[PDB]
Amino acid sequence: ALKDQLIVNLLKEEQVPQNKITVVGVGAVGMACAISILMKDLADELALVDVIEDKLKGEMMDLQHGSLFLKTPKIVSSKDYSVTANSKLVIITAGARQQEGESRLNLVQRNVNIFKFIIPNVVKYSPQCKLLIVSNPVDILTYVAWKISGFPKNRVIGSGCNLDSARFRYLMGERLGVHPLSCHGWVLGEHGDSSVPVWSGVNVAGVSLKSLNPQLGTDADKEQWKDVHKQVVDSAYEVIKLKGYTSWAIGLSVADLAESIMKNLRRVHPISTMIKGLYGIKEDVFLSVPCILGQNGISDVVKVTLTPDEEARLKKSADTLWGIQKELQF
Amino acid sequence: ALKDQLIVNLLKEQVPQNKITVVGVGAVGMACAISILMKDLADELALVDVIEDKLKGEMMDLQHGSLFLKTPKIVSSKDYSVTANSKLVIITAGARQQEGESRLNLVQRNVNIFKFIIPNVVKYSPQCKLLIVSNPVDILTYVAWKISGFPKNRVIGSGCNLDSARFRYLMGERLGVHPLSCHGWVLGEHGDSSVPVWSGVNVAGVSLKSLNPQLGTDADKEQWKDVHKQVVDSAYEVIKLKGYTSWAIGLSVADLAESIMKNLRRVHPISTMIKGLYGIKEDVFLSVPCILGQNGISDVVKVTLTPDEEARLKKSADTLWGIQKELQF
Amino acid sequence: ALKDQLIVNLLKEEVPQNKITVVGVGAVGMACAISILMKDLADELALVDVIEDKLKGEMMDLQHGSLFLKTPKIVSSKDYSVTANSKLVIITAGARQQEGESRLNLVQRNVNIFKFIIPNVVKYSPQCKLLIVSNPVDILTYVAWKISGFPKNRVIGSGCNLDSARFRYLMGERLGVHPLSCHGWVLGEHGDSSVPVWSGVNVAGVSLKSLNPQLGTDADKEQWKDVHKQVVDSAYEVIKLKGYTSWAIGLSVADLAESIMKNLRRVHPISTMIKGLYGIKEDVFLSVPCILGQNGISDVVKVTLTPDEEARLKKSADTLWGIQKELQF
Amino acid sequence: ALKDQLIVNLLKEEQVPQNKITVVGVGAVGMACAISILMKDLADELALVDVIEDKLKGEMMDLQHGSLFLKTPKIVSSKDYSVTANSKLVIITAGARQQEGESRLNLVQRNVNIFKFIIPNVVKYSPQCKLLIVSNPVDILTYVAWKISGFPKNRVIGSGCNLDSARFRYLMGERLGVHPLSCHGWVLGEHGDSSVPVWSGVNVAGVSLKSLNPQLGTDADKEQWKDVHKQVVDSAYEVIKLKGYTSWAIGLSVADLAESIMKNLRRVHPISTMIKGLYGIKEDVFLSVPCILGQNGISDVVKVTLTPDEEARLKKSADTLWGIQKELQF
Ligand SMILES: Cc1nc2ccc(NC(=O)CCNC(=O)CCCc3ccc(CC(C(=O)O)C(=O)O)cc3)cc2s1
Ligand SMILES: Cc1nc2ccc(NC(=O)CCNC(=O)CCCc3ccc(CC(C(=O)O)C(=O)O)cc3)cc2s1
Ligand SMILES: Cc1nc2ccc(NC(=O)CCNC(=O)CCCc3ccc(CC(C(=O)O)C(=O)O)cc3)cc2s1
Ligand SMILES: Cc1nc2ccc(NC(=O)CCNC(=O)CCCc3ccc(CC(C(=O)O)C(=O)O)cc3)cc2s1
C-alpha cells in the first residue's frame, strides 16, 4: 500500500476532538456562522446538521475543499445527531424566518415545535455542551431550549442583542467618524421591535454623549439620535427587503460569542439570559442584559443603572415577551 | 452639533491605500468578500453589481458586522466610480454552468458581459491587478487581458488554485496528512482538461511516483487517477447537491488576494499566458505555477513534465486555443 | 544559473506599500518588531541602530523565522537609506531609566540622539508618520515635531496608551472581567504625573464612580487610587524585577501601528499637541484621546474633566513645559 | 463591595483551563516562545516557571500588562510546579546554553541533571500533556525526557530541525526570489553540526532542483549551494557571535509546533523522535525525521528516500548522538 511505503504508523488513535463546535441548520445563517468560525480558528472539528440531506452534504464538501486554506482539520455532517458527539458548543440556527414586514414573534410556535425534536437530540450526544440559540424569536427560544434541555441556565445562551448593539455602534461610528470599536453603547431587552437603547451609557472615550446632549434619544433631540435605534430595530427588515434574508452580520456576531466561550474570555456581551430578579421581573423571562461570557457560558450579569424612561422601556420589552411566552406548551 | 462638542477636528482627504473591489455579489462574489474581510487584507472594500437592491442589501449586511472586522470602509454602487483607486479588482460576474453544462459553454455570454465590465474597471484604478474568477476562467483571463490592454503580469485567472487545493485535500484524506503538507499540482484548464502532475506529488520531498511508478495510471492498484477525476468532477458534484459552489472558491480567491496584497511571492497554479513553453506558440492562457506578488505574476516556474504530462498539457492548451479562435472583439 | 533554469522572469519590478521602520534594536525595539511581524502589518520591516553586530544579529534572527511570518523582506543598516519609503517609523532609540530613575532624567541624552535620528528619517521618508516611544515621550514627541518640520498629525507619541492598558488590566483583575470590556483612561504625562479619569471608568456603560461616589479619592473603602498608583509604578516594579520592560510596550506600540497602517480611526490615549485645550496656551504635547488612522492624529476627543481632574492635567501640563521651553537643538 | 454592586454572580467559579500551555524557562528563548504563543492565540492560560524569582515575576507582569492586546485571559507564574497543573502542552527551554565555540553536545550533563528535577515535576501536575523539548542538545534531551517522564514516545517531542529547515528554506527563497512557504527542503538528523540537508527533496512546485543541477550541494556546484547548509549549521554560532544569543527564530519555530499540536493539524515537521528500526539504526537514537504532528504528538513518521550519501550522512549523525547518549547516567 502506497501509504505504508511512505509513512510508518506509530499510533492508531481515534482522534477525539478537544474544541468541537456543531452548527445546527445550514441555511444562510448557519453557513455564515460556519465560515466565520472556520476563519477565526475556533474549532478543531466542525459538525453540521440539517434535515435536507443533499444541501447538507454539498455545504460540507464545499467547506472541505477549502481545507488547505483553513486550520480546522475535520469538517463533518449528518442528519444523525451522533455526528455532534463531544461538542463544547452547539449553535442552533434552525427554523422558520420572518417574511418581509413580519415580526419575529410570528415564528414562535413553529420554531418551538422544531426545538422539541432538535434539543433532546443535541443533549443526548453532548450533555455538557453550551447551547447558543440564534433562531427567532431568540429570547423565547432560549427559554424553551433551557426548559427542554434541563441544562443549568449558565449553559443556555441566546445570541440576543449582540448584533443590535454591533449595529448601534456601527451607525454611531458612521455619525461620529470613529471606528465602532471606540463607540460604546448598549441595546438591551428583546432582539426585536421592543429593544431598549441605553442612552445613559452611550459614550466615546468615557465621555457620555447624554452629558453633551441632555435630550439624547428623546423626541426633543435636535439630532434625532432615536432614529439610530429605529435603524437598529429596522435593520433586519431593510436587509430582508433588499437581499431577501440576512446572514453575514449575524454570522460574525455568533462567531464573536463563540470566541468568548471557546477561549474563556469573560468579555461582556448583551445576550439573552434569565432576568428573573432584576428591574422587578418575577417570571422566567429571558432577554438581553450585559453578561460575562466564558467557558461555562454566562457566569455573571452586569447590573445596569437604567433611567426611569429606560427602565420603563425595558419593563415593556419584558412584558411583550412574557405575553407570548406565558401561553406556551411543549 | 454633538460631534463637534465631542470631537475637535484637527485635520483636513486621503486615498485608500489597500483597496479591493469585488465585481459580482452572487454567492461567489460574497464568499470572496467575507473571506477577504476576515483575513484583514483591505482598508476599503467596494462591491459592484447590476441588481441594485441585492447589491445594497449585501453591502449593508457586511457593514453591520464592522465591529467584528478591521476594514473600516465598505461601499457599493452600480457605478464604477465607487471602485476608484483599487489595488486589486476581482471579477466574479457572469453566467454559471448548469448541471451537465461545460464551463466552455459560458464563453459568449460572459465575453459580452466582460466587454462592459473590464473598460469600466480599469478606468478608475491605474494600479490594479485584475483577478478573473468567472468561467471559463482561462479564456476569460485572455479576454480580460485583450480588452483591458494591461500587461500580462497584471491579469490573473484564479485558474487551478482551487483544483490544486481540492487535489491536496483528497490526497491528505488518503494519507491522513494535512493538505498543507501534501504537495501536488493540477495544471492546465480549470475544467475537464486539467492535468495532474504525478511526477511532482509528494510528502516531505518524497515522490509518491518513485514509490509506486504506476501512480495515476490505469495500472495503479490504488487508482490515484480517481483523485484527479474527483477534482475534475468536484464543481458538478457540489452543484448537484447544493445548486452552486461558493466557499472553496472564495477561500481560494482570498488566498491569491493575500499573496498579491502582501507581496508574498508564493507560488500558485493560476492562469497566465504560456506562449513560449512546452512548444506552445499561440497566446494561450492556462494554469502553471506562478510567483504572485504586488505586481501580479512577475515570474513563471518552468515545471519539468514527463512526455505524457506535457502532451496532456498541450492538449489542454489546444482545447482552450480552439475556444479562443471563437472570440470576436 | 539554477534560478533561471527554474524560473522565467516576466518583468523588473519597482517600492514596498506598507513599510515600517523600527529605530533601535534594544529590548523595546525588538518587542515592537516581533509584535508588528506577528500582526501582519508590514510588507517590509527595516531596523536601524548604531551597534552594528547587534543590529545584524537581530535582523538575522528575525529573518530565520520568515517561514512562519508574512513579512517578505526584513532589512537592517546603520545607514538610513534602508528606511526609504516607510509609511511608519517608530523611534525606540536612546537611554532608558535605571531602577529608581525618572524618565525626565533621560531628556538631554535622548534630545541629543534625536538631533541625529530625526533629520535622517525625514530625508528618506518625507511622508511618513513618526511614532515616538523613547522617553520622556511627551517631550521627545515635541522635539521630533520641531526637528522634522512635519505637521503635527504625523508626529505621534506612544504616550499613555500603555498606562491605560495597564489600568484596564488591573481593573479587569479586580472585577473578574476581560480588560477589553473594562474601560478607563489615564491621560497627561507618560510618567508620575499621569491623570486617571475616574468619571469615565466603566463596564458596559455603568460608571464605577456612580456606584461609588468616592472612587479614586482617599475616602474610597476599596482604595481604587492604588490602581492608578500601580499604573504609575509599573515600569519601576518591572525594571526592579527583570531590569527593563519590553513586552507590554511592544504590544501597545503594535496596537497603534495597527490603527495607523489599517486606517482604523480607533481612539487611543497618545501624545499630541494640546494647545487650545484645558487653558493650555503653549506648544505642549501630552496624552488625550486621539482618533488615529492613516494620516496620524486627525481628531481629538474633548474629555469633560472634573475641576480636580483638569487641575491634575494642567499640572501634568506645567511639569512638562518647564523642561521643554529651555531645550536647545 | 463595588464588584458586587456592579456584577451579580450567577455561577460558583470552578475554573479549569481547557487549552493551557506551560513554558519552563524565562530566558530569551522561553520568553520568545511565550510571546509567539500569545500572539497566535493558542492558549487560554499561560504558565511560566523558573528558579530566579524576581526575573520570573517581572516577565509574568510584563506579559500581563499587555493583556488588553491579547486573547489569553490568564497568565501565571511560580517556582512551584503546582502553577502548571492541567497543561495540554509543556515546553522545556531551561538549562545552560553554549558559549561561542562550544557544541550543544557539551551541555548534556548539565541539562540532564536539570531535567532530572524538571521532568518529574512537570508530569506530576500535567498527566495529559505533550512535552516539547527545546533545551540542548535537543535530540538527546528528548530521549532523556522520554525515559524520565514515563510518557509514551509520541508525547515527547523535540523541536529538533524544525528551525534548521526553516533557516534552509529562508536562504533558498532568498536565492530564488520565492517565499520560503513555496521553497521546500529538509534538514534532518541532529539539531547541530551533523545535520543533513536532503538535496534530493529540495524543490519548488514539485520541480527537483537537483534534477536541474545534478551537482547541487556538492563541492563541484558552481553556485555553491552546499554553503546554504553550511550557513544553516553555523546559524546559531553566527547569531550568538553578533547578538549574544538566539531567540526569535526558535520562538517562532516552537510556536509553529505548538500550533500543530494544539490544533491537531497533522502537519509534517522535522522534529526529534526515536528512529530505531530505520536506516539500519539499532539503538534508541532520537533525531529529526519528518513526523506527522497533532493532538497526541507524533503519530506517524515519513520514510524519506535518501541518496546513499544522504543516508550515510544521516547514519553518521545517529552515530555522533549515540556516542554521547551511550555514556549517560540518570
Ligand atoms: C426537526 C428539524 N430539524 C431541523 C434542522 C435544521 C433545519 N434547517 C433550517 O431550518 C435552516 C433554515 N433556517 C434558517 O436558516 C433560519 C435562520 C433564522 C435566523 C435568521 C436571521 C437572523 C438574524 C436577523 C434576524 O434576527 O431576523 C438579523 O437581525 O439580521 C437570525 C436567525 C430545519 C430543521 S426542522
Ligand atoms: C453588464 C453586467 N455587469 C455585471 C456585473 C455583475 C453581475 N453579477 C453577476 O453576474 C452575479 C452572479 N454571477 C456569479 O456569481 C457567477 C459566479 C461564477 C463562478 C461560479 C463558480 C466558480 C467555481 C466553480 C466552477 O468553476 O464552476 C468550482 O470549481 O467550484 C467560479 C466562478 C452581472 C453583470 S452583467
Ligand atoms: C545617534 C544614535 N542613533 C541611535 C540609533 C539607535 C540606538 N539604539 C538604542 O538606543 C537601543 C537601546 N535603547 C532602547 O532600547 C531604549 C528603550 C526606551 C524605552 C524603554 C521602555 C519603554 C516603556 C516603559 C516606559 O515608558 O518607561 C514602560 O512604561 O514600561 C519605552 C521606551 C541608539 C542610537 S544613538
Ligand atoms: C532545576 C532547574 N530548574 C530550572 C528551570 C528554569 C531555568 N531557567 C533557565 O535555564 C533559563 C535560561 N536558559 C535558557 O533560556 C536556555 C535556552 C536554550 C536554547 C537556546 C537556543 C536555542 C536555539 C539555538 C540553538 O539551538 O543553540 C539556535 O539554533 O538558534 C535553543 C535552546 C533553570 C532551571 S535549573
Chain A residues 77-116 with CB within 8 Å of chain B: none
Q: What is the resolution of this structure in A?
A: 2.0
Cell of A195: 429593544
Phi, psi of A73 (to 5 degrees): -80, -5
The residue type of A18 is Q
Kindly state whether residues B42 and B100 are assigned to the same domain.
Answer: yes
Kindly state whether residues B166 and B133 are assigned to the same domain.
Answer: no
With respect to residue C5, please indicate whether it lies within any of the assigned structural domains. Answer: no
With respect to residue B152, please indicate whether it lies within any of the assigned structural domains. Answer: yes
With respect to residue D37, please indicate whether it lies within any of the assigned structural domains. Answer: yes
User: SS3 for C317?
Assistant: helix
Give the ligand whose atoms come closest to the C-alpha of residue A122: 1
Chain C residues 176-195 with CB within 8 Å of chain A: 176-178, 180-181, 183-185
Specify whether the CB–CB gap between D154 and D128 falls below 8 A.
Answer: no
Kindly state whether residues A170 and A155 are assigned to the same domain.
Answer: no
- Any atom of ligand 1 within 6 Å of the Cβ of A126: no
Kindly state whether residues D147 and D77 are assigned to the same domain.
Answer: yes
Cell of A206: 468615557
Point out the domain boundary residue: C144, C159, C174: C159
Strands D130-133 and D89-92: parallel
With respect to residue A288, please indicate whether it lies within any of the assigned structural domains. Answer: yes
Cell of C86: 516607510
With respect to residue C191, please indicate whether it lies within any of the assigned structural domains. Answer: yes
- Any atom of ligand 2 within 6 Å of the Cβ of B118: no
List the beta bridge partners of residue C44.
C19, C73
User: SS3 for B307?
Assistant: helix
Using the beta-carbon criterion (under 8 Å), do A177 and B3 form an inter-chain contact?
yes
| Containing structural domain, residue C125 | 14-159
CATH number at residue D58: 3.40.50.720
Q: Which atom of ligand 4 is nearest to the CA of C61?
A: 30
Radius of gyration of chain C (CA): 21
Kindly state whether residues A192 and A224 are assigned to the same domain.
Answer: yes
Nearest CA among C29, C145, C59, B31 for reference residue D248: C59
**CA dist D134 → A39, A296, D23, D139 (Å):** 30, 34, 10, 9
Residues of B in contact with A52 (CB under 8 A): none
Task: Give just the sign of the alpha carbon dihedral C198, C202, C205, C210.
Answer: negative
Kindly state whether residues A38 and A153 are assigned to the same domain.
Answer: yes
Q: Report how far residue B163's alpha carbon sits from residue A103's, in angstroms, rounded to the nearest whole number.
A: 44
Point out the domain boundary residue: D108, D131, D160: D160
Beta-carbon neighbour count of residue D279 at 10 Å? 19
Chain C residues 160-179 with CB within 8 Å of chain D: 162, 165-166, 168-169, 172, 174-179
User: SS3 for A181?
Assistant: helix
Kindly state whether residues A245 and A138 are assigned to the same domain.
Answer: no
Residues of D in contact with A266 (CB under 8 A): 73
Q: Report how far residue D288's alpha carbon sits from residue A11's, in angstroms, rounded to the nearest whole number.
A: 18
Q: Which atom of ligand 4 is nearest to the CA of D164?
A: 29
What spacing in Å lies between the alpha carbon of A315 and ligand 1's midpoint?
28
Kindly state whether residues C178 and C300 are assigned to the same domain.
Answer: yes
Kindly state whether residues C164 and C281 are assigned to the same domain.
Answer: yes
**CA dist B178 → A18, A44, D193, D263, D293 (Å):** 18, 13, 31, 11, 10
Kindly state whether residues C174 and C302 are assigned to the same domain.
Answer: yes
Point out the domain boundary residue: A122, A137, A160: A160
Nearest CA among B277, A130, A156 for reference residue C7: B277
Count of domains forming chain A: 2
Cell of B80: 464604477
Specify whether the CB–CB gap between A132 and A89 falls below 8 A.
Answer: yes
Cell of B189: 484548464
Nearest alpha carbon, ligand 2 atom 5:
B49
With respect to residue A101, please indicate whether it lies within any of the assigned structural domains. Answer: yes
Look-up of cell digits 474549532: A43
Q: Report how far residue B294's alpha carbon sits from residue B257's, in angstroms, rounded to the nearest whole number.
A: 10
With respect to residue B166, please indicate whether it lies within any of the assigned structural domains. Answer: yes
- Any atom of ligand 1 within 6 Å of the Cβ of A217: no
Q: Report how far residue D267's alpha carbon sits from residue D258's, in angstroms, rounded to the nearest whole number.
A: 11
- Beta-carbon contacts of C318 under 8 Å, excluding residues fewer than 6 positions away, are none
Look-up of cell digits 479564456: B139
According to the entry, how was the structure determined? X-ray
Kindly state whether residues D318 and D175 are assigned to the same domain.
Answer: yes
Kindly state whether residues D172 and D284 are assigned to the same domain.
Answer: yes
Cell of A54: 443533499
With respect to residue B191, please indicate whether it lies within any of the assigned structural domains. Answer: yes
CATH number at residue D169: 3.90.110.10
Q: In what order do the strands lie in the sheet with C129-132?
A: B7-9, C296-301, C285-293, C266-273, C155-157, C129-132, C88-91, C19-23, C44-48, C73-76
Q: Report how far residue C289's alpha carbon sits from residue A204's, in angstroms, rounded to the nearest whole number.
A: 9
Cell of C204: 458596559
Phi, psi of C187 (to 5 degrees): -125, 175
Using the beta-carbon criterion (under 8 Å), do D205 and B178 form an inter-chain contact?
no
Task: Give just the sign of the alpha carbon dihedral C77, C79, C82, C88.
Answer: positive
Nearest CA among C177, C186, C184, C121 for reference residue C148: C121
Q: Which residues of A246-255 are buried (b: 16+ CB within 10 A; e: fewer)?
A: bbbbbbbbbb
